[PDB]
Ligand binder design. Structure first.
Ligand SMILES: *C(=O)[C@@H](NC(=O)Cc1ccccc1)[C@@H]1N[C@@H](C(=O)O)C(C)(C)S1
Length: 640
């Protein structure tokens, strides 16, 4: 019975070729054209599958429940069931028939129409009508639009209504001087390869008032994706682009005429936002008369998505960065609601999703400050803000006495002579330094000595209670925060640097706002939350409640004391508990070192808001504390 063994392989070899998209190789393992064999030629079957399976974007043909027999001398009948994925979802429970033929020694298939779809017969045709689904909206915690689809005023020119010569050059200089467009770019689009003398060539997108129209300038209304806050949330929201042929080859349930998320939340939530395509896939007669319907369902528009983001806080946080490199994260620390996730510099998502030049796109990628980076998801060394956690660990294990006063002389210190030339450095030469004094002046030497006194085992014991190595349940690509490169410092120097927020620490701004939430929840860490409806998740007993009641009053003095590093914030007249930081980054080539300014601040009275702002590669005299007054006033007013 070794004949049925070769027959099951012939059917298996045929389905694989169809599944692999190679229709020619599938057509070669069929029999010759005859009434008792195949119904079409090899090149005729190739065009049959390519036209039909291609029009429906058939992908992932897989079979099951195969049964091969032997009816006559060389007529071995076979049957199975199959399923496939098309533009309108999955087509399951398909009953296929057909027969085989094993003359000579090879088992060829007697091809028939019913090997394309179960009920195909002779010269039956296939039709596919689809209704595209509208993309869902992205909204803030109060329903404000962050990413919607709407009507736009598109500026464009037609070469015929421009004129002939001289008069045509004058309007090109007139259209360029009325819509903020380059005079050398109007002809760059008029003289493209696709242009004809009467076509409507697009130009710029008017995002407000429609000015006067020179000779040969029409504004047509076309619908497209629109981002109200613009660059203020471009990294977080992202942008959508035209769907390509390879996008369909990867997921046929898309829409060749639709838009797909290319970055940010538009890409992370692409499935829930794009919806599902409607329409029907049916088999018709030889004359086009509908015979059998294969797939059909209504068009379902995309779901809206409500974020915890405050649209007003998002814009204020971004604008406060003045276009400099940095990022700001604002939360309601008791719940974890991410109120703002700003990153600067940024790109224009409206220009990105509508029409953008290869020149402006190259300016974004070749910009050294890298406007495409989501800096709120980029790991940094936390700097001196991390002293709050090193101190709280020292209070939890009894290593740090808040009233114990260390005697530090000078601006440099080392454990012993084995450290060589390296020394911990502080900025203020305060002789008598206790915990409160250390947090006010941000004393690295106090922090380094208390860290070395604590020891690595006790230090990591307190550190592991946080979220180092954890993957936050957020729709944002990020790497987990890390304490060091390996599970052991293996260096007293690296142990000290980690104490005051340097060393090999890597914590992104979002993870910092999560780790620092303990000081607004009596030692309970509250995980951040971006989706409004999602349930609040927390982590009990990260630090002791005694340490919180000890450090938070000291953090008030970082603002209120005359020599506090955040004393400029006392001008606000609002209850503030803050901690500043300026992390130093080593330079590759012999170049001046780069510095990163940091600011942590929250309301110690009502715990209504908490923020963590930073500047990457800060300019001189620039800082995050310098720019925080406006956002702090808003968060204190609206989030209590
Ligand atoms: C924490 O970040 C500490 N920073 C340093 O020791 C590095 C440094 C950077 C610039 C100048 C001098 C030293 C301390 N905290 C910051 C801060 O709170 O801004 C200080 C500049 C006070 S030093």
């Amino acid at each position: 019975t070794q004949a049925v063994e070769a027959g099951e392989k012939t059917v298996e070899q045929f389905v694989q070729a169809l599944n692999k998209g190679d229709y020619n190789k599938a057509a070669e393992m069929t029999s010759k054209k005859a009434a008792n064999k195949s119904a079409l030629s090899e090149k005729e079957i190739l065009d049959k599958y390519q036209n039909i399976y291609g029009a429906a974007d058939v992908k992932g043909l897989q079979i099951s429940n195969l049964k091969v027999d032997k009816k006559d001398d060389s007529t071995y009948s076979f049957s199975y069931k199959a399923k496939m994925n098309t533009s309108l979802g999955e087509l399951k429970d398909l009953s296929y028939k057909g027969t085989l033929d094993r003359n000579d020694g090879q088992t060829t298939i007697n091809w028939q129409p019913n090997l394309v779809f179960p009920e195909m017969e002779g010269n039956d045709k296939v039709s596919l009508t689809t209704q595209e689904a509208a993309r869902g909206n992205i909204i803030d915690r109060n329903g404000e639009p962050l990413a919607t689809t709407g009507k736009l005023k598109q500026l464009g020119v037609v070469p015929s209504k421009l004129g002939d010569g001289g008069e045509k050059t004058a309007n090109i200089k007139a259209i360029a001087s009325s819509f903020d467009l380059t005079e050398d770019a109007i002809n760059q689009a008029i003289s493209q390869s696709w242009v004809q003398p009467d076509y409507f060539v697009p130009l710029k997108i008017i995002d407000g008032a429609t000015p006067e129209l020179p000779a040969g300038a029409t504004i047509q209304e076309v619908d497209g994706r629109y981002y109200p806050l613009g660059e203020a949330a471009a990294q977080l929201i992202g942008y959508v682009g035209d769907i390509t042929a390879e996008d369909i080859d990867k997921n046929p349930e898309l829409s060749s005429n639709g838009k797909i998320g290319r970055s940010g939340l538009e890409m992370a939530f692409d499935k829930d936002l794009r919806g599902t395509t409607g329409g029907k896939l049916s088999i018709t007669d030889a004359d086009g008369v509908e015979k059998k319907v294969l797939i059909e369902h209504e068009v379902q528009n995309g779901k809206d998505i409500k974020l915890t983001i405050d649209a007003k806080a998002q814009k204020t946080a971004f604008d406060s960065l003045g276009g400099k490199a940095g990022s700001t994260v604002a939360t309601t620390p008791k719940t974890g609601d991410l109120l703002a996730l700003a990153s600067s510099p940024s790109y224009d998502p409206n220009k990105m999703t509508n029409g953008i030049s290869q020149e402006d796109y190259k300016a974004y990628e070749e910009n050294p400050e890298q406007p495409f980076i989501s800096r709120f998801a980029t790991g940094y060394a936390p700097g001196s803000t991390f002293k709050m956690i090193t101190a709280a660990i020292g209070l939890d294990n009894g290593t740090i006495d808040p009233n114990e006063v260390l005697t530090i002389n000078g601006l440099k210190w080392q454990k012993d002579s084995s450290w060589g030339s390296y020394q911990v450095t502080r900025v203020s030469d305060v002789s008598q330094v206790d915990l409160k004094t250390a947090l006010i002046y941000s004393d690295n030497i106090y922090t380094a000595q208390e860290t070395l006194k604590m020891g690595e085992k006790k230090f990591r014991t307190g550190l592991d209670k946080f979220i180092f190595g954890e993957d936050l349940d957020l729709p944002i690509s990020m790497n987990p925060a890390q304490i060091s490169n390996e599970d052991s410092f293996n260096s007293d120097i690296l142990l000290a640097d980690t104490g005051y927020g340097q060393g090999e620490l890597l914590i992104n701004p979002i993870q910092q706002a999560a780790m620092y939430s303990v000081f607004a929840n009596n030692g309970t860490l509250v995980y951040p939350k971006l989706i409004a409806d999602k349930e609040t998740k927390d982590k009990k007993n990260v630090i002791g409640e005694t340490a919180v009641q000890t450090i938070v009053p000291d953090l008030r003095e970082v603002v209120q004391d005359v020599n506090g590093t955040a004393h400029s914030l006392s001008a606000l007249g609002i209850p503030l508990a803050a901690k500043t930081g300026t992390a130093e980054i080593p330079a590759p080539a012999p170049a001046p070192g780069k510095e990163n300014s940091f600011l942590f601040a929250f309301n110690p009275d009502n715990q209504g808001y908490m923020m963590v702002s930073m500047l990457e590669n800060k300019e001189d005299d620039d800082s995050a504390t310098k720019r925080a007054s406006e956002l702090l006033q808003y968060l204190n007013q609206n989030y209590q």
